[PDB]
Design a protein around this nucleic acid. Structure first.
Ligand code: NA
Ligand code: NA
Length: 331
DNA sequence: CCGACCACGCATCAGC
DNA sequence: GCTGATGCGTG
DNA sequence: GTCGG
């Protein structure tokens, strides 16, 4: 259960501001992740926070952020946040990572050499790798939400495309859209194939061959990166005659070995808390989960040798849990 | 006081 | 050339 | 930054 707008949003936003900043311009992924947990926890909390101490009571809140909340509540802002927002560097630095393939090193990099806008990006492409190029490109496309409907449409081709290449292949979208969402971030595509398994001899062809299918039939425009296991590229929808070209959407495909699909499948599908709580449970029954397997948790504290999973149900079954639908993998 | 915080593929980058 | 490490991005 | 050894 989650309410939250006129509730805590102010707080939750100054927070995320805070996070991004730490990431992007400070290079504190941990500190970044904190602020994130914090803001998230508060996002959930059914009340209107009246004090720092009040929030402190929360699991991620602590003194420093608690203090923040007091300055916010009282003043209606955060001095710190104002300078930063006013700060040239931090800003250009902030913005610049909005571009895919740019991180904080690059971003801080560019920015030093006086590069700091889109234009400078525009007028210096020589100084950008491919990944960074494709996203200088599709900047705007990149910050767009994907409408599961389009998504649906999306779902077809890939399903079909692969259907042709091989009948035995196994594709199944995942991520948010599996989670019945009404608007995704990108299409996530999970796939495998019979001839593809752990201890087996990995056939590059598999991923290879399929990206090409989707390539052949103009589904995938650009390419961010590729390897035997997973493809990170761009895709597009057949523009309907006299209907304006949709945007270009990020997509990723994932090739997995038969013996560890489902866990992977399982794992991928999330959600976040979903993973957190399940792993906890699977433990109680005496097991330890990850992205590839499940193993009988030792009689001595820790023990190996994974179990044979042939379905998400199979997994659920080991930990003695109801085959949860993806729809409700809320946690 | 002080380490942990998810693991992991691929691309580029430092080095040798 | 190859190796190993560091950037970036993903569910 | 927070939480925990
Ligand atoms: Na707390
Ligand atoms: Na970025």
């Amino acid at each position: 259960k989650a309410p939250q707008e006129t509730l805590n949003g102010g707080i939750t936003d100054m927070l995320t501001e805070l996070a991004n900043f730490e990431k992007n311009v400070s290079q504190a992924i941990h500190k970044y992740n904190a602020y994130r947990k914090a803001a998230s926890v508060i996002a959930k909390y059914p009340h209107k926070i009246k004090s720092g101490a009040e929030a402190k009571k929360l699991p991620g809140v602590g003194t420093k952020i608690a203090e923040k909340i007091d300055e916010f509540l009282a003043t209606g802002k955060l001095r710190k946040l104002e300078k930063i927002r006013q700060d040239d560097t931090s800003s250009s630095i902030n913005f610049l990572t909005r571009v895919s393939g740019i991180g904080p090193s690059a971003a801080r990099k560019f920015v030093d050499e006086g590069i700091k806008t889109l234009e400078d990006l525009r007028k210096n492409e020589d100084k950008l790798n491919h990944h960074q190029r494709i996203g200088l490109k599709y900047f705007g496309d990149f910050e767009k939400r994907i409408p599961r409907e389009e998504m649906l449409q999306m779902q077809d081709i890939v399903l079909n495309e692969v259907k042709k290449v091989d009948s035995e292949y196994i594709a199944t979208v995942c991520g948010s859209f599996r989670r019945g969402a009404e608007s995704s971030g990108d299409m996530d595509v999970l796939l495998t194939h019979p001839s593809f398994t752990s201890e087996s001899t990995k056939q590059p062809k598999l991923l290879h061959q399929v990206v090409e299918q989707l390539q052949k039939v103009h589904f995938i425009t650009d390419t961010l990166s590729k390897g035997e296991t997973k493809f990170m590229g761009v895709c597009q929808l057949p523009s309907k005659n006299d209907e304006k070209e949709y945007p270009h959407r990020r997509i990723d495909i994932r090739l997995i070995p038969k013996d560890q699909y489902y866990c992977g499948v399982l794992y991928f599908t999330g959600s976040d808390i979903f993973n957190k709580n399940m792993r906890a449970h699977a433990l109680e029954k005496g097991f330890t989960i990850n992205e590839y397997t499940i193993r009988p948790l030792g009689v001595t504290g820790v023990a190996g040798e994974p179990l044979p999973v042939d379905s998400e149900k199979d997994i659920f079954d080991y930990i003695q849990w109801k085959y949860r639908e993806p729809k409700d993998r809320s946690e």
